[PDB]
Scaffold this active site. Sequence first.
Site, short mmCIF file in Angstrom:
data_model
loop_
_atom_site.label_atom_id
_atom_site.label_comp_id
_atom_site.label_asym_id
_atom_site.label_seq_id
_atom_site.Cartn_x
_atom_site.Cartn_y
_atom_site.Cartn_z
N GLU A 23 -10.85 -2.44 -7.65
CA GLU A 23 -10.05 -3.23 -8.38
C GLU A 23 -9.23 -4.04 -7.46
O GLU A 23 -8.19 -3.53 -7.08
CB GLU A 23 -9.57 -2.67 -9.49
CG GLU A 23 -8.85 -3.92 -10.49
CD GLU A 23 -7.30 -3.57 -10.91
OE1 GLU A 23 -6.83 -2.41 -10.58
OE2 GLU A 23 -6.84 -4.26 -11.75
N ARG A 83 -14.89 2.80 -10.89
CA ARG A 83 -14.15 1.68 -10.71
C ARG A 83 -12.72 2.15 -10.22
O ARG A 83 -11.94 3.01 -10.76
CB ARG A 83 -13.52 1.08 -12.18
CG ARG A 83 -12.77 0.00 -12.00
CD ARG A 83 -11.89 -0.27 -13.36
NE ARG A 83 -10.88 -1.44 -13.21
CZ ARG A 83 -9.36 -1.24 -13.19
NH1 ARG A 83 -9.06 -0.21 -13.39
NH2 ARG A 83 -8.94 -2.47 -13.22
N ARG A 88 -20.31 -7.60 -15.71
CA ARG A 88 -19.55 -6.49 -16.58
C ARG A 88 -19.28 -7.20 -17.73
O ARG A 88 -18.43 -8.12 -17.79
CB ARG A 88 -18.37 -5.99 -15.87
CG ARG A 88 -17.66 -4.90 -17.12
CD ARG A 88 -16.47 -4.22 -16.18
NE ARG A 88 -15.48 -5.16 -16.26
CZ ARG A 88 -14.46 -4.98 -15.14
NH1 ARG A 88 -14.39 -3.81 -14.61
NH2 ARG A 88 -13.45 -5.86 -14.99
N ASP A 106 3.68 6.55 -5.88
CA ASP A 106 2.37 6.41 -4.91
C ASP A 106 2.21 7.50 -4.16
O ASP A 106 2.67 8.22 -3.40
CB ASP A 106 2.85 5.19 -3.86
CG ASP A 106 1.80 4.29 -3.67
OD1 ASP A 106 1.38 3.67 -4.40
OD2 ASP A 106 1.36 4.27 -2.44
N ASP A 136 -9.21 1.81 -9.35
CA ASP A 136 -8.22 0.96 -10.03
C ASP A 136 -6.97 0.83 -8.88
O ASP A 136 -6.75 1.88 -7.86
CB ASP A 136 -7.55 1.91 -10.99
CG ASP A 136 -6.14 1.50 -11.52
OD1 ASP A 136 -6.19 0.68 -12.45
OD2 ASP A 136 -5.01 1.61 -10.88
N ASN A 185 -10.84 -9.27 -18.46
CA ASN A 185 -10.91 -7.55 -18.16
C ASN A 185 -9.78 -6.89 -19.35
O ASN A 185 -9.24 -7.78 -19.57
CB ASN A 185 -10.76 -7.09 -16.67
CG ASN A 185 -9.40 -7.17 -16.31
OD1 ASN A 185 -8.57 -7.78 -16.72
ND2 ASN A 185 -9.21 -6.26 -15.39
N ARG A 198 0.98 -1.18 -0.07
CA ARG A 198 -0.03 -0.20 -0.02
C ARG A 198 1.07 1.30 0.05
O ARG A 198 0.57 2.36 -0.63
CB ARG A 198 -0.84 0.10 1.37
CG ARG A 198 -2.23 -0.67 1.17
CD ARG A 198 -2.21 -2.11 0.92
NE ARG A 198 -3.71 -2.73 1.12
CZ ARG A 198 -3.98 -3.41 2.39
NH1 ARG A 198 -3.20 -3.30 3.53
NH2 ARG A 198 -5.30 -3.63 2.30
C1 LIG Z 1 -4.99 -0.15 -13.02
O1 LIG Z 1 -3.91 1.02 -13.14
C2 LIG Z 1 -2.44 0.18 -13.54
F1 LIG Z 1 -1.51 1.13 -13.56
C3 LIG Z 1 -2.00 -0.62 -12.37
O2 LIG Z 1 -3.01 -1.90 -11.95
C4 LIG Z 1 -2.85 -0.40 -14.74
O3 LIG Z 1 -1.54 -1.31 -15.11
C5 LIG Z 1 -1.21 -1.26 -16.49
O4 LIG Z 1 -0.31 0.04 -16.62
C6 LIG Z 1 0.92 0.24 -15.77
C7 LIG Z 1 1.34 1.70 -16.04
O5 LIG Z 1 1.60 2.33 -17.52
C8 LIG Z 1 1.88 -0.94 -16.06
O6 LIG Z 1 3.06 -0.82 -15.25
C9 LIG Z 1 0.91 -2.19 -15.78
O7 LIG Z 1 1.98 -3.45 -16.10
C10 LIG Z 1 -0.06 -2.40 -16.80
O8 LIG Z 1 -0.66 -3.57 -16.38
C11 LIG Z 1 -3.84 -1.59 -14.63
O9 LIG Z 1 -4.15 -2.14 -15.86
C12 LIG Z 1 -5.24 -0.69 -14.27
O10 LIG Z 1 -6.44 -1.75 -14.09
CA LIG Z 2 -0.54 3.07 -2.57
CL LIG Z 3 -11.39 -4.47 -13.27
#
Ligand SMILES: *[C@@H]1O[C@@](F)(CO)[C@@H](O[C@H]2O[C@H](CO)[C@@H](O)[C@H](O)[C@H]2O)[C@H](O)[C@H]1O
Ligand SMILES: [Ca+2]
Ligand SMILES: [Cl-]
Length: 496
Positions: free
Chosen positions: A233, A195, A337, A167, A197, A298, A158
């Site tokens: 997520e 959603r 979904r 972060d 993320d 997804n 986290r």
């Molecule tokens: C949520 O946001 C994410 F950034 C992390 O879970 C997404 O991840 C994708 O983008 C990142 C940044 O470009 C890559 O490092 C990562 O490998 C890629 O899967 C995720 O898909 C979103 O759901």
């Molecule tokens: Ca965090």
């Molecule tokens: Cl998702």
Amino acid sequence: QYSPNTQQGRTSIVHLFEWRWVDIALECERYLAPKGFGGVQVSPPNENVAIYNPFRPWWERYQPVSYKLCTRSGNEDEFRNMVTRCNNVGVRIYVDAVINHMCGNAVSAGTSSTCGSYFNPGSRDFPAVPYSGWDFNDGKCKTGSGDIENYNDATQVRDCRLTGLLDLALEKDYVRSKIAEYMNHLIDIGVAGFRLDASKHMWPGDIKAILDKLHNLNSNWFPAGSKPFIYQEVIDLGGEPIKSSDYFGNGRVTEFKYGAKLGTVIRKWNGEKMSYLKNWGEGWGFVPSDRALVFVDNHDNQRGHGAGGASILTFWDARLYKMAVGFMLAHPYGFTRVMSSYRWPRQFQNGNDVNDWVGPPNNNGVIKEVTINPDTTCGNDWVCEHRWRQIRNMVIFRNVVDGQPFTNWYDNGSNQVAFGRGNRGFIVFNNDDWSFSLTLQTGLPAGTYCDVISGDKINGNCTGIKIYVSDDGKAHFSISNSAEDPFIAIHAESKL
Ligand SMILES: *[C@@H]1O[C@@](F)(CO)[C@@H](O[C@H]2O[C@H](CO)[C@@H](O)[C@H](O)[C@H]2O)[C@H](O)[C@H]1O
Ligand SMILES: [Ca+2]
Ligand SMILES: [Cl-]
Ligand SMILES: OC[C@]1(F)O[C@H](F)[C@H](O)[C@@H](O)[C@@H]1O
Ligand SMILES: OC[C@]1(F)O[C@H](F)[C@H](O)[C@@H](O)[C@@H]1O
């Protein structure tokens, strides 16, 4: 948080992955509304880093630069137009909220962003928000690399950087407020939910604090007191300290076990069979149905970028995919979904797709519009699974049987099963290597029903298979293992 806020009768949302706002607005009016779709999950609407190496990957949108509604999908005007037009037709919009982090810490400083905003990852400077070094967890994270290294340590998961993504210090009221400002901006525009993320990478308590600052939905379209739909997520499969249940106090959670297990079952991996789906749902260790956001695949795992692994079924596995989606849409467990994707040049090497980064169909970086073919399918490399007769009709099936109980289950001890939903619907599946011919109890009133998988009900006639239910509710079903679609579905509204 927990209610989708969809119009009564609409039970599913579709992920129009990387679609442009203008295209979504049109889709809402020309297809989603008439077909009974509940809502649309849109790609992140906030400004992101423009990545040219590789060339405009889909994942660049998960690297925020600011909260300006300015992306390859369109600007704020186009976004507002879409939300308004969709809401006016009873189709909700859910935003993919990227609030756990900003862009990669190693990304070059400059104006390589979708709106030209300046940013400097190195110095933690995001003036367009604005965010500074004081707004990140650089000092909170205790790992030697500054990134997440061990998922067995719930704290670093986290407070540290997910694969280098800066972060945000979500415990700070300033940061919480900046995120709330962005989300409230969207809510007031008309969005029905979000959603969240990378929720596993955020403290349940921090998410709650942010949600506590959110407005009620826009009173011009929603009843007073309506709260935004929240689905976090959280990737929670086997043994891990963090559990998706830790987030139930904030809203629903994505149930990644759903698609992973359904994929293994339909693929018949390691002895699994459809007859085992009898107790599908909580019986399989899944989260409570009222906290589940389910899906077969997804945007992440359909390209080996997420949870599920190689078992995940996608449009590439069209035949089996339709069956998986069909079972999901017919089964009462959770809120469904449906995925809608684009085609890309899959290049497998040593088991991994080296082109899994390829972004949406485009011309010199400009996303292509979604064209509609005379047969209602899509062109320009958009797959439009939600437009597939077998999927679209199952989306309607779910609407028609909404509220009806899971009953009249049948199975041959192998991969031939069937079940109904009260007296409003019945579905039969044949995933065995032999034909299925048998008379089953449908629990449906006598009459002639159109199979909505092989065809449609048009002006008092069926274009595909026809099913005859007797006075005792029984009906004969015949499905060859060689059929284009080895499953049949009939409901109250498919009755002649
Ligand atoms: C949520 O946001 C994410 F950034 C992390 O879970 C997404 O991840 C994708 O983008 C990142 C940044 O470009 C890559 O490092 C990562 O490998 C890629 O899967 C995720 O898909 C979103 O759901
Ligand atoms: Ca965090
Ligand atoms: Cl998702
Ligand atoms: O989801 C947040 C949480 F984990 O569970 C409940 F929501 C509690 O009210 C909250 O204070 C706690 O942080
Ligand atoms: O419960 C508080 C919290 F939500 O979760 C943990 F306690 C974190 O250490 C803290 O910073 C965060 O605000």
